[PDB]
PDB file of C-alpha atoms in Angstrom:
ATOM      1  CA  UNK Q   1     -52.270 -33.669 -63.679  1.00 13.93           C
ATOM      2  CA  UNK Q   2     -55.011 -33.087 -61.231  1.00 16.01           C
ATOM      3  CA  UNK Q   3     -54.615 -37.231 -59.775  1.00 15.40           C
ATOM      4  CA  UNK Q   4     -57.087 -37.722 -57.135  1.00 17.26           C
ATOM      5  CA  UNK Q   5     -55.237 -40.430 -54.967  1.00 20.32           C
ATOM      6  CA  UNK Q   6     -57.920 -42.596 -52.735  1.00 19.28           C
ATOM      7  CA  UNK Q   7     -54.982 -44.761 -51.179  1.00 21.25           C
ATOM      8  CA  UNK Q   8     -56.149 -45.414 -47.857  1.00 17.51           C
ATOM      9  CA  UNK Q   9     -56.943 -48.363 -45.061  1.00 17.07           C
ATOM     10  CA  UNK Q  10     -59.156 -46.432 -42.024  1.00 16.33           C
ATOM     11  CA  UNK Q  11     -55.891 -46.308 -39.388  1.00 14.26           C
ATOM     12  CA  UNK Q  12     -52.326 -42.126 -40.830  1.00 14.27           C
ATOM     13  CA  UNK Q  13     -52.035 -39.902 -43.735  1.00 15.10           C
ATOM     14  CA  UNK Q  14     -48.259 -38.922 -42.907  1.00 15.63           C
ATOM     15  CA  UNK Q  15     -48.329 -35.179 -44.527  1.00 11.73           C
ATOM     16  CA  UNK Q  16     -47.341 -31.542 -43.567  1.00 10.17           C
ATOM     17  CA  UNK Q  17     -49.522 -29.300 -44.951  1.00  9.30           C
ATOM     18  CA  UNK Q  18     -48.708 -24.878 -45.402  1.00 12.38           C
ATOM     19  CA  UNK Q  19     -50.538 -22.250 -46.112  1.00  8.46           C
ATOM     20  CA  UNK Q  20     -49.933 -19.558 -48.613  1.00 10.57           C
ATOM     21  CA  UNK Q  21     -52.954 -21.702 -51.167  1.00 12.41           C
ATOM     22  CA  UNK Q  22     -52.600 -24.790 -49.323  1.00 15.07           C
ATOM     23  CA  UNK Q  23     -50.392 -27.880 -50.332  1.00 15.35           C
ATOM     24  CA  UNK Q  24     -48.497 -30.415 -49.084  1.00 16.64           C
ATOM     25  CA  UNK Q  25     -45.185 -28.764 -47.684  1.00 18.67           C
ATOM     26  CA  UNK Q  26     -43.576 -32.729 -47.080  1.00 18.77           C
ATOM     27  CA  UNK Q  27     -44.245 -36.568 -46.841  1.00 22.09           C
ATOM     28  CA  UNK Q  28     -43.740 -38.163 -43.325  1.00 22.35           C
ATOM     29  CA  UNK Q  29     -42.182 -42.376 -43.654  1.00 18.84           C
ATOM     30  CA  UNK Q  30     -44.988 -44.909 -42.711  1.00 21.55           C
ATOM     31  CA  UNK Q  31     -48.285 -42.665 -43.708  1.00 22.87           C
ATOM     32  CA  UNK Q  32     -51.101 -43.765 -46.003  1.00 24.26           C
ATOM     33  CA  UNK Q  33     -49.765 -41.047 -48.102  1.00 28.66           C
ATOM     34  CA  UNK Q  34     -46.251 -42.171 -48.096  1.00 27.33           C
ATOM     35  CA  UNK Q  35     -47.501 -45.616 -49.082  1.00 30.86           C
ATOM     36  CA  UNK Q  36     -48.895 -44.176 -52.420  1.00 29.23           C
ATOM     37  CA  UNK Q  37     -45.762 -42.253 -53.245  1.00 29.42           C
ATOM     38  CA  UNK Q  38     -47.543 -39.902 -55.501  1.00 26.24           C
ATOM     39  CA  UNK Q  39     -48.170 -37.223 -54.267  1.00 23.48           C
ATOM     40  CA  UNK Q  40     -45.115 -35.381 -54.361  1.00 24.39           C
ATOM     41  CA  UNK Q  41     -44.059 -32.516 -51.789  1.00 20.15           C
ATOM     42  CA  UNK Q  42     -45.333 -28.913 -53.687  1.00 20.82           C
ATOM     43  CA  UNK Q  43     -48.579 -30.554 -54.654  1.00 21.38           C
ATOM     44  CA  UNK Q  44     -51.519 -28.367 -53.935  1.00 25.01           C
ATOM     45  CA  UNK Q  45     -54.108 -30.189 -52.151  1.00 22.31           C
ATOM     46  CA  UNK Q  46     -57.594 -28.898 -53.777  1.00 23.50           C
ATOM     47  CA  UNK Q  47     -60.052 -31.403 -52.004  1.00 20.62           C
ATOM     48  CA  UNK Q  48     -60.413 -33.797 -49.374  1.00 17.33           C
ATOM     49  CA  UNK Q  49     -63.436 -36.706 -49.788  1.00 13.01           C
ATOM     50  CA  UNK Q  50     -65.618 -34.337 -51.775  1.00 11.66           C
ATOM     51  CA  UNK Q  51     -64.507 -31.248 -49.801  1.00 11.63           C
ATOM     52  CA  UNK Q  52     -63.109 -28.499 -50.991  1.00  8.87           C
ATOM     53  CA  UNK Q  53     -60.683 -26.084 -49.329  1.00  9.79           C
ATOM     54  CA  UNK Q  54     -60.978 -23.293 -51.877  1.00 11.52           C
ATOM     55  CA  UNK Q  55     -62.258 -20.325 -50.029  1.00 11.27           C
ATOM     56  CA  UNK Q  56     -62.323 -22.118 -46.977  1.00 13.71           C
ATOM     57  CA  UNK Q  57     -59.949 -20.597 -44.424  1.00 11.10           C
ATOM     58  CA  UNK Q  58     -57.254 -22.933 -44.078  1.00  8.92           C
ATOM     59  CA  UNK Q  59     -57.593 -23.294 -40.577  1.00 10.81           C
ATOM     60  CA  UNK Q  60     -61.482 -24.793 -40.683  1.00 11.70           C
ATOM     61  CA  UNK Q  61     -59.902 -26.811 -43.641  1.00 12.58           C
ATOM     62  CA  UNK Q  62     -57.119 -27.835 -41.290  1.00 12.46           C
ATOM     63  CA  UNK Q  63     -59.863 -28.768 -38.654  1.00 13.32           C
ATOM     64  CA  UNK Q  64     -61.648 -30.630 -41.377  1.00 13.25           C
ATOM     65  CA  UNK Q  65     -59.162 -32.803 -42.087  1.00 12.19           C
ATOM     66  CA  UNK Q  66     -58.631 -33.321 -38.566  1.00 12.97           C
ATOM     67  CA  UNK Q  67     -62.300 -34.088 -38.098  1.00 15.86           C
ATOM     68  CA  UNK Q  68     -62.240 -37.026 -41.180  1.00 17.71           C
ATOM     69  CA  UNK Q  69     -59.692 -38.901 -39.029  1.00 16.39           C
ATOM     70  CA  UNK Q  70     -63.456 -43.723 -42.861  1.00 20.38           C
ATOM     71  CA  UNK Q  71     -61.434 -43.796 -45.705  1.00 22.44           C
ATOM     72  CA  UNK Q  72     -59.410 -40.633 -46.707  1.00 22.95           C
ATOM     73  CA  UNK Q  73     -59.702 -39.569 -50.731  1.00 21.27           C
ATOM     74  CA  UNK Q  74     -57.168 -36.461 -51.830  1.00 19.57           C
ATOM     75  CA  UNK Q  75     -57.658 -34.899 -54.847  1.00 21.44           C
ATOM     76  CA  UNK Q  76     -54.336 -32.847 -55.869  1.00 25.03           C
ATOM     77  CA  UNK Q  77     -52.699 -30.893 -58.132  1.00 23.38           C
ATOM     78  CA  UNK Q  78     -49.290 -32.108 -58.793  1.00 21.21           C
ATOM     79  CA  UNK Q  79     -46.763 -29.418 -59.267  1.00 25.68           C
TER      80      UNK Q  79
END
């Protein structure tokens, strides 16, 4: 249950992302992620291309994936 989606095609992921403990709060139309379809609003979004947010404040993790806008792999823990 832990899918690790790589959908991607270098140009917009198309997510919302809160902080509690950070996952994807909704899916945007016309985003990379929206294109996959699988990972669901509630998800909790454990890594980002190798990275991992666990610890990490969310902000710098927010920056992160800022900064990695190459290809975009998510690694998540559907609900």
């Amino acid at each position: 249950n832990i899918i690790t989606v790589t959908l991607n095609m270098e140009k917009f992921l198309g997510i919302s992302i809160v902080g509690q403990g950070i996952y994807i709060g909704s899916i945007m139309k016309g985003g990379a992620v929206a294109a996959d379809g699988r990972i669901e609003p509630g998800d909790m979004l454990l890594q980002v291309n190798d990275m991992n947010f666990e610890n990490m404040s969310n902000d710098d993790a927010v920056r992160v994936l800022r900064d990695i806008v190459g290809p975009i792999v998510l690694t998540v823990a559907k609900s």
